Design an enzyme around this catalytic site. Sequence first.
Site, PDB file in Angstrom:
ATOM      1  N   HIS A  62       0.728  -1.088   0.033  1.00 23.73           N
ATOM      2  CA  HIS A  62      -0.236   0.308   0.002  1.00 23.73           C
ATOM      3  C   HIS A  62       0.696   1.500   0.455  1.00 23.73           C
ATOM      4  CE1 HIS A  62      -3.700  -2.605   1.331  1.00 23.73           C
ATOM      5  NE2 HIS A  62      -2.569  -3.039   1.652  1.00 23.73           N
ATOM      6  N   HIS A  88       4.479   7.208   7.671  1.00 27.69           N
ATOM      7  CA  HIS A  88       4.942   6.631   6.058  1.00 27.69           C
ATOM      8  C   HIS A  88       3.957   7.448   4.917  1.00 27.69           C
ATOM      9  CE1 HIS A  88       0.114   6.266   7.713  1.00 27.69           C
ATOM     10  NE2 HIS A  88       0.183   6.786   6.820  1.00 27.69           N
ATOM     11  N   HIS A  90       1.976   8.977   1.187  1.00 27.44           N
ATOM     12  CA  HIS A  90       1.527   9.103   0.093  1.00 27.44           C
ATOM     13  C   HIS A  90       1.623  10.298  -0.718  1.00 27.44           C
ATOM     14  CE1 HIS A  90      -1.915   7.050   3.229  1.00 27.44           C
ATOM     15  NE2 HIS A  90      -1.449   8.318   3.907  1.00 27.44           N
ATOM     16  N   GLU A 100      -2.758  13.854   0.611  1.00 26.30           N
ATOM     17  CA  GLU A 100      -4.114  13.303   1.022  1.00 26.30           C
ATOM     18  C   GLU A 100      -5.217  14.383   1.703  1.00 26.30           C
ATOM     19  OE1 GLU A 100      -4.188   9.775   3.881  1.00 26.30           O
ATOM     20  OE2 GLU A 100      -4.775   9.177   1.936  1.00 26.30           O
ATOM     21  N   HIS A 113       3.091  10.977   7.259  1.00 26.87           N
ATOM     22  CA  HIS A 113       2.031  10.912   8.548  1.00 26.87           C
ATOM     23  C   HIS A 113       3.063  10.350   9.430  1.00 26.87           C
ATOM     24  CE1 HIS A 113      -1.676  10.432   5.734  1.00 26.87           C
ATOM     25  NE2 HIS A 113      -1.606  11.966   6.197  1.00 26.87           N
ATOM     26  N   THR A 192      -6.687   7.072   7.007  1.00 27.17           N
ATOM     27  CA  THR A 192      -7.179   7.014   5.827  1.00 27.17           C
ATOM     28  C   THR A 192      -6.880   6.112   4.777  1.00 27.17           C
ATOM     29  OG1 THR A 192      -4.980   7.914   4.865  1.00 27.17           O
ATOM     30  CG2 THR A 192      -6.338   9.451   5.816  1.00 27.17           C
TER      31      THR A 192
END
Length: 254
Positions: A62, A88, A90, A100, A113, A192
Site C-alpha cells: 500500500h 509513511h 502518500h 491526502e 504521516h 485514511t
Amino acid sequence: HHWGYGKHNGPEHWHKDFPIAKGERQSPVDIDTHTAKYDPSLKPLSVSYDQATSLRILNNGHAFNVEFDDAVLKGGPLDGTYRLIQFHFHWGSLDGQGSEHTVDKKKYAAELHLVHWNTKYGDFGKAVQQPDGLAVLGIFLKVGSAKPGLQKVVDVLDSIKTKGKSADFTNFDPRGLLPESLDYWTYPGSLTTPPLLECVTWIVLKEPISVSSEQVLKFRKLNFNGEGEPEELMVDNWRPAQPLKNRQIKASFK
Ligand SMILES: COc1cccc(CN2CCc3cc(OS(N)(=O)=O)c(OC)cc3C2)c1
Ligand SMILES: [Zn+2]
Ligand SMILES: [Zn+2]
C-alpha cells in the site's frame, strides 16, 4: 479481493467492507482557509523525537512504513502523551497530486504521516478503538530543494521495491523530516486507510517540507505487487478529501 487504490478496489469501494467510510468524522479533508478558525487555547506542538528508535522499513503493498520501538508527541491540541509507532507517505503519479489533505483545494506532491498512539490506552491496538486514541502529524511535501533528512529513506527504497520486502532501518532520526515552523491546523478525524477508524486527532502542519524531484521520483519506482508478479507501480496511494460534516478545523496561527 483486498482493498487498494485501483479502479476496482480503491477508495470508492472501501465502504462495502468498512461502512464507517461514510461516517461522521472521516479523513482526509480539504482545509478551507476562508473558514478555518484561529484558536488561542491551542498550545505549541511539542515534538520530542531525540530518543526515537527506528527499527525497519517495509513495503506493505500500500505504501512503505518505517516502524519504531514504541519518541513522544504532546502539547498542541492534545491532552497527555502519544508515542511514535511508525511513519509513511502518500504520493502521486505526477508532482501535481499525491497529498491526502488539501489546502483551498491545492494538492501537494506527497504527504508524510507520523502516527502516534495515546499512552493512556496501553498499546496501539487498544488506542485505535477510542476517539482520542491516535494523533497523526501530517506534513506536506512540495518539490524544490532536497531534504537531507529524507535521503536515507529514498535511497533504501531500491531494496524494498515489492510487497513484503523489508530492510534494516536503525538509527533514522525523524527530526530531519520536519519543517522550520510547527504552526498547524487540527480537527477530529479518522485513519485514511481501512479500517478507517474514527480515532485520530489530526495535526496538519501549515508549512510544507521541500524535497527534490530526484527524491520524490524514487517513491514512484516502488511496486504494489509482490516479486515475480504483474508489475503494478506504487503511485496515487491517496484517499480523496471527505465530507467535513459538522466539524470545525482550528488553526494555531493567526
Ligand atoms: C500495530 O503496530 C504497527 C506498527 C507499524 C506499522 C503498523 C501499520 N499501520 C499503523 C497505522 C497506520 C495508519 C494509517 O492511517 S493514516 N493514513 O495515517 O491515517 C495507515 O494508512 C496509510 C497505515 C498505517 C500502518 C502497525
Ligand atoms: Zn494489504
Ligand atoms: Zn497516511
